[PDB]
């Protein structure tokens, strides 16, 4: 009835947005503060009150669903925020078995809500994120060539050494730490060279090649930030010679008007 | 009347604007030539020439607040300068006590006056600053992603380790130490990996965030430099369409003359 309207007035109200912000900062404050070696009781009141705030999260998503069942489920942020208000949900109930505690790793995910609330972020990180996609190709080159070389290295470099480069899961992790350029002199190419006196062969060109899918990368972003000021450009330069094409119509009709007498 | 006469001529005197700089330079020289342990008592002396060059300056900032009253507080270089100098002689009232090592660090900061007496510095550092504003709000995203993590990895390293991680005000430092790429491999993670196995989940998507935004903060000041020298070119091809117009428009007023003839 008017129920339906004081919904209809009171949900969608700014005021109810800004007090759930308040709110949300209130919980990473209060989360905040942890030191571990403390040994005092209150860490069971902060669980105490962590069972507060949960279920008013519950009821604030009870309370945007209600609105809308058809269009809540586009605008893939409230998707993500409710999937982690759910998770945060299923932690209460259970707890995990022993050594498990992947369960507890859960509801420590309910920080990322200050990014998925405040509006301004979410138009600054859609703004981040809009270039990604015609970026995509380079990513996945850079890909292809770790798993080719990834290929290569753990069966060179195998029978022998068999903590940096033995499987495959973790010569992915060496040659990560390898691009980064930290410590792939001192650290990992020295030694090796030791006992394979050739392994500079295989080090020394791949420093090059994906150093150089990087730097073009950052270029790629560089023409895309450039190409939205000379369509502006070009737009202003078609505007102006509009206006001239525009002048001389009118005394080319003259001349046209000064031919019957 | 010819006293204040006297004081603009030599306020705005090309000459004695550089006497301060050569005053500058030389305290910074005499404040640069102290070789640390001394093993000899000319420290006294060297303590006895901090107090002239103090008086120097008390005699400086009376002088320019002579001319001036409203004209110096709408600008935000004298009043930077003012203040140094006003912190370096609440140091010359008070004590260096050995219990509270505060008040040396004042007496060290008149070193920044360098930068703001020169003017060609003071332009060239305004130049600079003119991009940060319109920057901001990368950066303030930057601080909420810190804030974040550092939240989130508090709670999960920080049961062993107590060093670390151990609170956010030194959780805050280690993660600042993993962002710019210095030893986050052979003296952070992998001293993780011995009792956490899945460490690198939490770590290496982190490279993955922040580095993407400081190439793109790069981008923009890379942005802002060619916006201004299109406002050049933008510009003088216009003026040239203005050339273009002016020269036919005369000979279209031939059309409008020689109707009176037909």
Same mark, same amino acid.
């Given at each position: 009835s008017h129920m339906y309207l004081r919904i209809t007035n009171i949900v969608e109200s700014s005021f109810f947005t800004k007090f759930i912000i308040y709110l949300i900062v209130l919980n990473t404050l209060f989360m905040a503060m942890e030191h571990h070696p403390m040994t005092e009781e209150f860490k069971n009141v902060l669980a105490i009150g962590n069972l507060v705030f949960t279920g008013i999260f519950a009821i604030e998503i009870i309370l945007r669903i209600y609105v809308h $069942?058809?269009? *809540? *489920?586009?605008?893939p942020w409230s998707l993500f925020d409710s999937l982690i208000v759910t998770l945060s949900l299923v932690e209460l109930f259970l707890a995990d078995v022993e050594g498990l505690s992947v369960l507890r790793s859960f509801? @420590? @995910? $309910?920080? &990322?809500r200050l990014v998925t609330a405040v509006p301004q972020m979410r138009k600054i990180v859609s703004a981040l994120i809009s270039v990604i996609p015609g970026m995509l190709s380079v990513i996945a080159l850079m890909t292809l060539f770790f798993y080719i070389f990834a290929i290569m290295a753990t069966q060179l470099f195998g029978? $022998? &050494?068999?903590?940096? *480069?033995?499987?495959l899961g973790e010569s992915f992790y060496t040659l990560f730490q390898v691009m980064t350029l930290e410590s792939w002199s001192m650290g990992i190419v020295r030694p090796l060279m030791e006992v394979y006196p050739y392994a500079w062969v295989f080090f020394i060109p791949f420093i090059f090649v994906v150093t150089f899918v990087m730097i073009n990368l950052v270029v790629a972003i560089c023409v895309d930030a450039m190409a939205i000021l000379n369509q502006k450009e070009e737009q202003h330069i078609i505007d102006e010679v509009q206006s001239h094409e525009d002048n001389i119509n009118n005394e080319i009709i003259k001349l046209r008007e000064e031919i019957v007498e």
């Open positions: $069942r058809i269009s *809540f *489920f586009k605008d509801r @420590l @995910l $309910r920080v &990322f029978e $022998r &050494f068999p903590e940096w *480069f033995g499987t």
